[PDB]
Curated annotation (Swiss-Prot), chain A:
Has been predicted to contact the N-terminal domain of IF-3 based on footprint studies; exactly how IF-3 interacts with the 30S subunit is controversial. The lineage of its organism: Bacteria, Pseudomonadati, Pseudomonadota, Gammaproteobacteria, Enterobacterales. It comes from Escherichia coli (strain K12). It comes from the Bacteria. This is Small ribosomal subunit protein uS11. PROSITE patterns: RIBOSOMAL_S11. The gene is rpsK. GO terms for biological process: cytoplasmic translation; translation.
From Swiss-Prot, chain B:
It comes from the Bacteria. Part of the 30S ribosomal subunit. Forms a tight heterodimer with protein bS6. The gene is rpsR. SUPFAM superfamilies: Ribosomal protein S18. PROSITE patterns: RIBOSOMAL_S18. This is Small ribosomal subunit protein bS18. Belongs to the bacterial ribosomal protein bS18 family. InterPro entries: Ribosomal_bS18, Ribosomal_bS18_CS, Ribosomal_bS18_sf. Keywords: Acetylation, Ribonucleoprotein, Ribosomal protein, RNA-binding, rRNA-binding. Pfam families: Ribosomal_S18 (PF01084).
From Swiss-Prot, chain C:
GO terms for molecular function: mRNA binding; rRNA binding; structural constituent of ribosome; tRNA binding. Keywords: Ribonucleoprotein, Ribosomal protein, RNA-binding, rRNA-binding, tRNA-binding. The gene is rpsG. This is Small ribosomal subunit protein uS7. The keyword Ribosomal protein applies. The lineage of its organism: Bacteria, Pseudomonadati, Pseudomonadota, Gammaproteobacteria, Enterobacterales. Part of the 30S ribosomal subunit. Contacts proteins S9 and S11. Cross-links to IF3 and the P and E site tRNAs. The chain holds residues 2 to 153 of 179 of the full protein. The strain K12 sequence is shown. It comes from Escherichia coli (strain K12). One of the primary rRNA binding proteins, it binds directly to 16S rRNA where it nucleates assembly of the head domain of the 30S subunit. Is located at the subunit interface close to the decoding center, where it has been shown to contact mRNA. Has been shown to contact tRNA in both the P and E sites; it probably blocks exit of the E site tRNA. Protein S7 is also a translational repressor protein; it regulates the expression of the str operon members to different degrees by binding to its mRNA. One of its GO terms (biological process) is translation.
From Swiss-Prot, chain D:
Residues 59-70 have a biased composition (Basic and acidic residues). InterPro entries: Ribosomal_bS21, Ribosomal_bS21_CS, Ribosomal_bS21_sf. This is Small ribosomal subunit protein bS21. It comes from Escherichia coli (strain K12). The lineage of its organism: Bacteria, Pseudomonadati, Pseudomonadota, Gammaproteobacteria, Enterobacterales. One of its GO terms (biological process) is cytoplasmic translation. GO terms for molecular function: rRNA binding; structural constituent of ribosome.
Length: 117, 67, 152, 70
RNA sequence: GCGGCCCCCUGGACGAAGACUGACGCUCAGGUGCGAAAGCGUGGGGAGCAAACAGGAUUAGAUACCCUGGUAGUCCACGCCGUAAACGAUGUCGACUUGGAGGUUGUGCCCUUGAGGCGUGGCUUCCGGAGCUAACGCGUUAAGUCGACCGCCUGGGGAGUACGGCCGCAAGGUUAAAACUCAAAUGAAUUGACGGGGGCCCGCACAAGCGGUGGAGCAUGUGGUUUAAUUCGAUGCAACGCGA
RNA sequence: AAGGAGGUAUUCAUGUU
C-alpha cells in the first residue's frame, strides 16, 4: 500500500532457525519470513539453503511497498548469514549497508551449563 | 614492530590525546593487542588505562554499534 | 580401486554404423554373451524407429539419448551424520551409460511382444519425453532437488 | 564490523570485504565461547595446555632445522 | 586468592646512594590468627544460572546423560563452619657449586649517532651440565653439596573408622585404636595385546556395476525327531555336494 | 569446509582508502 523505497532487513540467524524481517528505517516491521515457516523442519531448517528461501519469500511478501534500497543488519552465529544477503541481492534490492549487530555481553549474565553428550 | 612510546620518551600516555589513542583502537573500538602493535608491556598497561578513561568521558566509543 | 591407476578398455565400433555409443548399447542390452542375438535386436529396433521418426538411425537414437541423460544424481555421505544425500553432477561418460541402462531397463519391463518392438517403442517414448526411461530421469532430478539443501 | 557499500563495487566484492571484516573482529569465535559457562579452572587448564604445546612445537621446529631427513 | 574506571583509608616488595643501630638473629611444640566452594543462623535482595523437584524424550529398564521449566543456593550485612587433588602432591632459614634462551620490574655507563652497545640488582618460564633420582626426573628458584629448627612415615584391608576428650546451632571437624583378615598392597620402567586415542597404507573390504542366494519344485549335506539299527567322525569364520 | 603459500612476523612513508 504505502511506499517507502528504503527499508532495513534484519537477519536473525540462530543455530536452529533464521528469521528475516524487513522494516522501515524507524523500526516498523513491514513483513517477515522464517526458514522454519518456508517448509523446512529440523535438519533442513538449520541449513543455509533454507535461509536463502526465507529471504526470497520475505522479499516477495514486501513487494507492495516499492522498496528499492535495503540496509542489512545480521545477528547471530547462524548457518545462514550470507545466503540471505546473496538472495536479497539476487531478488533485486540495492544493498547499501551491511553491518553485524550480534549482541556481545561485556561479561554480563552467566551462560547455561555445558552439554554432556 | 618497535614501540612508539619508548622511542619518544613518553612518560604517561594521557587520555586527552585522542590522536595517539585512535591509532591504538580498532574499527569496532576495542583495544588492539600489544602482540600486534609491538608496544611494550609497561606502556600497554598505561595505554589501556587511558583508553578506558577516554571511553568514560565519551572521547572514544565503547563499541561501534551503540552509536 | 584403492591403488587406483586402472585404465579404460577400448571398445570397437559397431560394424553397420561405426558408432561406439551403439556398440556400448548392444553390450548393455546383451545377455549371456549372446552378442549376435542382441545385435540383431538393436538393428531391427533402429530400422523400425527410423521408419517411424524418419531421420537417420544414429540421429534418432541420439535424440532419445538426449531426453534420458541425467544431469545430477544423489550419492550418500557417511561423514556428517551418515544420513546425507548429496546431489552431485554426473560426468558426460556416465550420462551416456545411465541413459542407455535406463532405456534398456524400460524396454525390458514393457508389454509388447518382441524385444525389437519393445525397444523401438521405448526409443520413441524417449524421443517424445513420455516413457518410463524419461520418467526415471525426471524422478532422479526431483530427488536431487529435494536434497539441494545438502548440496553445499 | 559496519561495511558501507562503495561506488561501483559489485556485491560479491563488497560481501567478501564484509565477511573478512567480521572474521577480523572475531565475532563468531566470541559467540561460540559464550554459548556455555566453563569453570575458571577449566579455562585456566585450557590456556596453560595451549601455551605448553605451542612452546613445545616451536622448540621442536627450531631443532628440526638442525638435522637432515635424507 | 585478587581483573571495568574514579576517589578515600591502608599493607608489603624492590632499586640508587648515603647515614644510623650494633647480633637486636633463625626455627618453633602449645597457643593465636587468616583460610576456596558447599553448608548453617538472622535479616535483606533476586536479572541470569541452577541441586531438589515437575514434566518431555532416550532406553530391555533410565530414580542418569538430552529437552522445557524450576526451589534452596549463588549476591548483600552480620555471625557459625574450618575443609579441599587447600598441589610444586616438594616445611621454613642460610651458605656453596658449569651454562643457554626468554619474560617482567629497577638502575649505571657508553656515541642516544636511529628502537644501539656495555654492565649490575629483584622476581619469573623453559632447556640443560656435573651430581642427585628404583626409575620418571631434578638441576644455581635442586630433588647437588652442607648446617639450624620444626612436621610426619613404619605392609594392605579393617580405618582416618569405633570409643573417649575437645570444638560446633547443626552438618560435622579434630585427636585416634583394636580384634580380626591377607601374603601380598605398592612406585617406576620394559615386551605385548588392547582403546566407542592419533596418523599412514592395503585387500572384490566398501563404493560403481553384473549375476545370483533367501520365495517354488527337485538333488545333496547337516541338525532334530523317529527307529531294532537309523555306524562313526568334521560342526563359529577355518563343519554342513565335508572323510565318501 | 578444502587446499596453497609465508612466518612464529613483521619494519614495510603517510595519504588514499
Ligand atoms: Mg541449551
Ligand atoms: Mg601449632
Ligand atoms: Mg559461600
Ligand atoms: Mg545464608
Ligand atoms: Mg534469605
Ligand atoms: Mg536442567
Ligand atoms: Mg587435609
Ligand atoms: Mg588452589
Ligand atoms: Mg596448581
Ligand atoms: Mg599434603
Ligand atoms: Mg630440566
Ligand atoms: Mg571421624
Ligand atoms: Mg570423636
Ligand atoms: Mg557391493
Ligand atoms: Mg530355495
Ligand atoms: Mg552323522
Ligand atoms: Mg559327529
Ligand atoms: Mg572316534
Ligand atoms: Mg573331536
Amino acid at each position: 500500500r504505502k511506499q517507502v523505497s528504503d527499508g532495513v532487513a534484519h537477519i536473525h540467524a540462530s543455530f536452529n532457525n533464521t528469521i528475516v524481517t524487513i522494516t522501515d528505517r524507524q523500526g516498523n516491521a513491514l513483513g517477515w519470513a522464517t526458514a522454519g515457516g518456508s517448509g523446512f523442519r529440523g535438519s533442513r531448517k538449520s541449513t543455509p539453503f533454507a535461509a536463502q528461501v526465507a529471504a526470497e519469500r520475505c522479499a516477495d511478501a514486501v513487494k507492495e511497498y516499492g522498496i528499492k534500497n535495503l540496509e542489512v543488519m545480521v545477528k547471530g552465529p547462524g548457518p545462514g548469514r550470507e545466503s540471505t544477503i546473496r538472495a536479497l541481492n539476487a531478488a533485486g534490492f540495492r544493498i547499501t549497508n551491511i553491518t553485524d549487530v550480534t549482541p556481545i555481553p561485556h561479561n554480563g549474565c552467566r551462560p547455561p551449563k555445558k552439554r554432556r553428550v | 614492530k618497535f614501540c612508539r612510546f619508548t622511542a619518544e620518551g613518553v612518560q604517561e600516555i594521557d587520555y586527552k590525546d585522542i590522536a595517539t589513542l585512535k591509532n591504538y583502537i580498532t574499527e569496532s573500538g576495542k583495544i588492539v593487542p600489544s602482540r600486534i602493535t609491538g608496544t611494550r608491556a609497561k606502556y600497554q598497561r598505561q595505554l589501556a588505562r587511558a583508553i578506558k578513561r577516554a571511553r568514560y568521558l565519551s572521547l572514544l566509543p565503547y563499541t561501534d554499534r551503540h552509536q | 580401486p584403492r591403488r587406483r591407476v586402472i585404465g579404460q578398455r577400448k571398445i570397437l565400433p559397431d560394424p553397420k554404423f561405426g558408432s561406439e555409443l551403439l556398440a556400448k548399447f548392444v553390450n548393455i542390452l546383451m545377455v549371456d554373451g549372446k552378442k549376435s542375438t542382441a545385435e540383431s535386436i538393436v538393428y531391427s529396433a533402429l530400422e523400425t524407429l527410423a521408419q517411424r521418426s524418419g531421420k537417420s538411425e544414429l540421429e534418432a537414437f541420439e535424440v532419445a539419448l538426449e531426453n534420458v541423460r541425467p544431469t545430477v544424481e544423489v550419492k550418500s555421505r557417511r561423514v556428517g551424520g551418515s544420513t546425507y544425500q548429496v546431489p552431485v553432477e554426473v560426468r558426460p561418460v556416465r550420462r551416456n551409460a545411465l541413459a542407455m541402462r535406463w532405456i534398456v531397463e524400460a524396454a525390458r519391463k514393457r508389454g509388447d511382444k518382441s524385444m525389437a518392438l519393445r525397444l523401438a517403442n521405448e526409443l520413441s517414448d524417449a524421443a517424445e519425453n513420455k516413457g518410463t526411461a524419461v520418467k526415471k530421469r525426471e524422478d532422479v532430478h526431483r530427488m536431487a532437488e529435494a536434497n539441494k539443501a545438502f548440496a553445499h | 564490523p559496519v561495511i558501507k557499500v562503495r561506488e561501483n563495487e559489485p556485491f560479491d566484492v563488497a560481501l567478501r570485504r564484509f565477511k573478512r571484516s567480521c572474521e577480523k573482529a572475531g565475532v563468531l569465535a566470541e559467540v561460540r565461547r559464550r554459548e556455555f559457562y566453563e569453570k575458571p579452572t577449566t579455562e585456566r587448564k585450557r590456556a596453560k595446555a595451549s601455551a605448553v604445546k605451542r612452546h613445545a612445537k616451536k622448540l621442536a621446529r627450531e631443532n628440526a632445522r638442525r638435522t637432515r631427513l635424507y
